[PDB]
From a paper:
The archaeal GTPase factor aEF1A (eEF1A in eukaryotes, EF-Tu in bacteria) delivers aminoacyl-tRNA to the ribosome in its GTP-bound form. After codon recognition by the aminoacyl-tRNA and GTP hydrolysis, aEF1A is then released from the ribosome in its GDP-bound form. aEF1A also delivers aRF1 and aPelota in translation termination and mRNA surveillance pathways, respectively. The ribosomal protein called the “stalk” which is in the ribosomal large subunit plays a crucial role in efficient action of translational GTPases3,6–8. In archaea, the ribosomal stalk protein, aP1, and its anchor protein aP0 form a heptameric complex aP0•(aP1)2•(aP1)2•(aP1).
A part of the ApeP1C17 peptide (S103 to F111) was observed in a hydrophobic space between domains 1 and 3 in an extended unstructured form. This P1 binding site was ~25 Å away from the GTP/GDP-binding site in domain 1. The structure of the ApeP1C17•ApeEF1A•GTP•ApePelota complex revealed that the three hydrophobic amino acids, M108, F109, and F111 of ApeP1 make contact with several amino acid residues of ApeEF1A in the complex. Thus, M108 binds to R140 in domain 1 of ApeEF1A via van der Waals interaction; F109 binds to R329, F331, I421, and I423 in domain 3 of ApeEF1A via van der Waals interactions; F111 binds to R140 via hydrogen bonding, and to F401, R409, and I423 in domain 3 of ApeEF1A via van der Waals interactions. Notably, the highly conserved F109 of ApeP1 binds to a hydrophobic pocket that is formed by the hydrophobic amino acids F331, I421, and I423 of ApeEF1A. These results indicate that aP1 binding has no substantial effect on the overall structure of ApeEF1A including the GTP hydrolysis site in the domain 1. Of these residues, only the conserved M108 and F109 of ApeP1 (L106 and F107 in PhoP1, respectively) are involved in binding of aP1 to both aEF1A•GDP and to aEF1A•GTP.
Numbering used by the authors:
A (entry chain A): 4 to 435
B (entry chain X): 103 to 111
C (entry chain B): -1 to 355
The structure:
């Protein structure tokens, strides 16, 4: 069984967590006693219909707000594949976590809501059906399944007129981003009632397309960039007794084996890998695809954190003192200039980086040096610029390691632009 | 808006 | 409150003043100039006896050579060659470096006379306080102390928090909101801050806000919505509508809204702004400038030509009822001004580029 990382994206309360909640319960993985225990507590607070969501959502704020905030990781398997499913947050305040999830994803489920106003809020200027589709694309997610959720709702009622209409507007938008619009399944489902999740819904005989499980098995596994350096961007870092300090992350490139001495950049801390765990399975090695926990002798919890990237000492990950990049400005209120310092989201990292130069402007539909050292960039422009990270950042050239060299520029609770890194002035490798 | 930009994506 | 400014002689070349706030030290930094002679009572070591020295307090007049001001120190640091002092100590012609404090009487003389605008500016320092701004999310906490004339990041921490699946994650965020709240209260005390703005996404900022109100009920506390924590979140808060109302008297903050207006114009209506010392001066003579945003280092540039040119423009815009906003280059607004020669101006009408002499 090959392995694939699935990420769940969509606008706030369009039904990501209940989809993953109910989909697991139907495939067997949620206990009856647990599901109803969650229903009772859900009901005891003013949150009756968040029973499936509370399998995924856990924090004090997540349960009080009824909002996914950080990524929840879970495991299941179909006929053909075994999945790491990654329930990501909808709310605009936490799209930085959606990006860290998107950087690990081999494919995505775009949960869109067929309810009136909710689809429109998802696809408006500042919506997240739109933004997560943008961000998912730039982070490397090529495969995509879309689930037109909430078909059962009073203001929809299993309607085809709605399903055809919502698919129409998404098809127009995604073909702009450069997606294979005829090749991706648009599944009218209900996450709450469970329609089309595993077995065909009687309530939509007009459908004739694949169900969510049948669409999951449709997905092809990704290629494996082996014959490349070791890159494991860390997602989290735990202190689990029986193991010590164990960072968790997806391996993007190379091969991690037990006993390998590893270095975590930017900190420069070195540690021996003592064990490798994936879905509670003991591994002697991990390869591109594998989202693993890996214990490390020598490193402590205070030494490393999310955004740090692990590699062998042979060729450690590049710490960019400065870095050059080609970018495209999606939105900006006024104008971008030398000095501007948006947050650069690469792999699992989110680091402010000052634009220290604008080397050239470029035409957005072609891309040749129109102007040289322009005074400003505005929305709709593309350009070559030189960043200086406000704090130590790991990036890599897009030519060499594209997954560590593709990024979003965010600022002011909006995505300003997107870009790839074309050069890196590296930092002084400072090992202990 | 006009967002048809590929960086070899 | 405001600086006691008091013109002495007939020709209005001499002024006697006493800074009574840190804003009054800032006003001295933006006002004073290499060539002014201050008259301060300082101490200076002098060789008296045989192989022996005594710290003897004395009155000196010093031809100013250097004016530097580090924020949140209560010290305008001055230096220069002593032009007059007691004759037995032999100090005339020697360098005296020292520091003007809050409470320090100093008389200062300008050869070509003090203007009415210069004095008005010198007496403008209604002693505005010094807020603290912080930002909290699950990844980061930062805290900074904000004056009109300076900003300083006092804390910048990563909440190296467990993954939400980890047991004890819930108690670890509790310790983290205590550690954050503690540090806010600590520095609001250390800086005598009336307001404390707390940025962040969601409930963490309110959790932290409650803890500081508990430990300081006299302290005002604002919660501002914001996309992220850390220094970015602090810098994000400075541009929000909320904070521009609550801290509207702070240049640093004021600067960001004109800068935004200047840049919104550079895209569309290029002729309704100007930048760079000479182009600003050109349109300032015309009576075109509404407000001028300025980096404070231009006032002290080692080139004589630009200190005179920048002063002429500033004098001109305020002579025709324009605003003049002076800020540190070491600030979030200040950083964007480097590519515009340190100065930007908003114009009251379009001035074509071939008309700017
Ligand atoms: N009628 C109906 N309601 C749904 C469905 N799916 C979700 N909901 C409701 O939508 C609300 C939010 O559900 P969640 O699964 O938390 O939505 P989410 O997208 O995971 O939330 P975020 O991750 O914070 O964006 C709850 O009140 C659910 O009952 C559905 O298929 N049908
Ligand atoms: Mg969710
Ligand atoms: Na939700």
């Amino acid at each position: 069984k090959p392995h694939m990382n699935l990420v769940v994206i969509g606008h706030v309360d369009h039904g990501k967590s209940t989809l993953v909640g109910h989909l697991l319960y139907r495939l067997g993985y949620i206990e009856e006693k647990k599901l109803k225990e969650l229903e009772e507590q859900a009901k005891s607070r003013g949150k009756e219909s968040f029973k499936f969501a509370w399998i995924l959502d856990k924090m004090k704020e997540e349960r009080e707000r009824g909002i996914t905030i950080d990524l929840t990781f879970m495991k299941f398997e179909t006929k053909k594949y075994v999945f790491t499913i990654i329930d990501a947050p909808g709310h605009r305040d936490f799209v930085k976590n959606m990006i860290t999830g998107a950087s690990q994803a081999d494919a995505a489920i775009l949960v869109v809501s067929a309810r009136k106003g909710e689809f429109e809020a998802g696809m408006s200027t500042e919506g997240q059906t739109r933004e997560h589709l943008l961000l998912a694309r730039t982070m490397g997610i090529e495969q995509i399944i879309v689930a037109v959720n909430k078909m059962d709702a009073p203001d929809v009622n299993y309607d085809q007129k709605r399903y055809e209409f919502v698919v129409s507007v998404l098809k127009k938008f995604m073909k702009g981003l450069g997606y294979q619009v005829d090749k991706i399944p648009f599944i009218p489902v209900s996450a709450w009632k469970g329609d089309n999740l595993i077995e065909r819904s009687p309530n939509m005989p007009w459908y004739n397309g694949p169900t969510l499980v049948e669409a999951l098995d449709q997905l092809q596994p990704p290629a494996k960039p082996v014959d490349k350096p070791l890159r494991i961007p860390v997602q989290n870092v735990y202190s689990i007794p029986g193991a010590g300090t164990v960072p968790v992350g997806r391996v993007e490139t190379g091969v991690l084996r037990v006993g390998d001495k590893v270095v975590f950049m930017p900190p420069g801390v070195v540690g021996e890998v003592r064990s490798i765990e994936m879905h509670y399975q003991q591994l002697q090695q991990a390869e591109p695809g594998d989202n693993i926990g890996f214990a490390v002798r020598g490193v402590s919890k205070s030494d490393i954190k999310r955004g740090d990237v692990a590699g062998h000492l042979d060729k450690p990950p590049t710490v960019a003192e400065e870095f050059e990049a080609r970018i495209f400005v999606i939105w900006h209120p006024s104008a971008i200039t030398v000095g501007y310092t948006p947050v650069i989201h690469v792999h699992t990292a989110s680091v402010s980086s000052r634009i220290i130069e604008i080397k050239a402007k470029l035409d957005p539909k072609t891309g040749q040096v129109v102007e040289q050292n322009p005074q400003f960039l505005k929305a709709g422009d593309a350009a070559i610029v030189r960043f200086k990270p406000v704090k130590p950042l790991v990036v890599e050239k897009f030519s060499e390691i594209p997954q560590l060299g593709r990024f979003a520029m965010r600022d002011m609770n909006r995505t300003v632009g997107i870009g790839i890194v074309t050069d890196v002035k590296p930092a002084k490798v400072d090992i202990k | 808006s006009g967002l048809s930009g590929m960086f070899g994506f | 409150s405001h600086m006691r400014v008091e013109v002495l002689d007939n020709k209005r070349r001499i002024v006697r003043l006493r800074p009574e706030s840190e804003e009054d030290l800032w006003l001295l930094r933006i006002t004073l100039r290499p060539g002014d002679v201050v008259r301060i009572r300082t101490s200076r070591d002098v060789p008296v006896g045989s192989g022996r020295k005594e710290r003897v307090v004395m009155t000196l007049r010093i031809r100013l050579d250097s004016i530097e001001f580090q924020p949140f120190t209560g010290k305008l640091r001055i230096s220069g060659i002593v032009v007059e002092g007691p004759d037995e100590f032999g100090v005339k012609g020697r360098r005296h470096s020292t520091a003007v404090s809050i409470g320090t009487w100093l008389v200062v003389e300008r050869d070509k006379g003090w203007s009415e605008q210069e004095l008005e500016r010198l007496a403008s320092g209604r002693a505005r306080g010094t807020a603290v701004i912080a930002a909290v999310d699950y990844d980061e906490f930062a805290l900074a102390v904000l004056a009109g004339h300076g900003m300083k990041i006092l804390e910048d921490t990563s909440a190296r928090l467990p993954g939400k699946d980890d047991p004890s994650r819930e108690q670890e965020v509790e310790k983290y909101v205590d550690r954050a709240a503690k540090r806010i209260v600590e520095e609001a005390a250390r800086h005598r801050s009336p307001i404390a703005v707390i940025a962040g996404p969601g409930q963490l900022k309110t959790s932290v806000a409650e803890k500081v109100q508990r430990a300081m009920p006299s302290l005002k506390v604002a919660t501002v919505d914001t996309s992220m924590g850390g220094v970015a979140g602090v810098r994000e808060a400075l541009r929000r509508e909320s904070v521009t109302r609550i801290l509207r008297e702070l240049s640093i903050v004021e600067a960001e809204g004109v800068l935004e207006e200047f840049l919104r114009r550079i895209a569309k209506s290029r002729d309704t702004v100007a930048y760079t010392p000479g182009e600003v001066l050109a349109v300032a003579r015309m009576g075109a400038v509404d407000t001028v945003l300025l980096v404070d280092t231009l006032l002290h540039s080692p080139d004589d030509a630009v200190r005179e040119a920048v002063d002429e423009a500033l004098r001109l815009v305020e002579s025709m009822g324009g605003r003049v906003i002076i800020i540190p280059g070491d600030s979030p607004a200040g950083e964007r001004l480097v590519s515009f020669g340190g100065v930007i101006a908003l114009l009251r009408y379009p001035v074509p580029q071939e008309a700017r002499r």
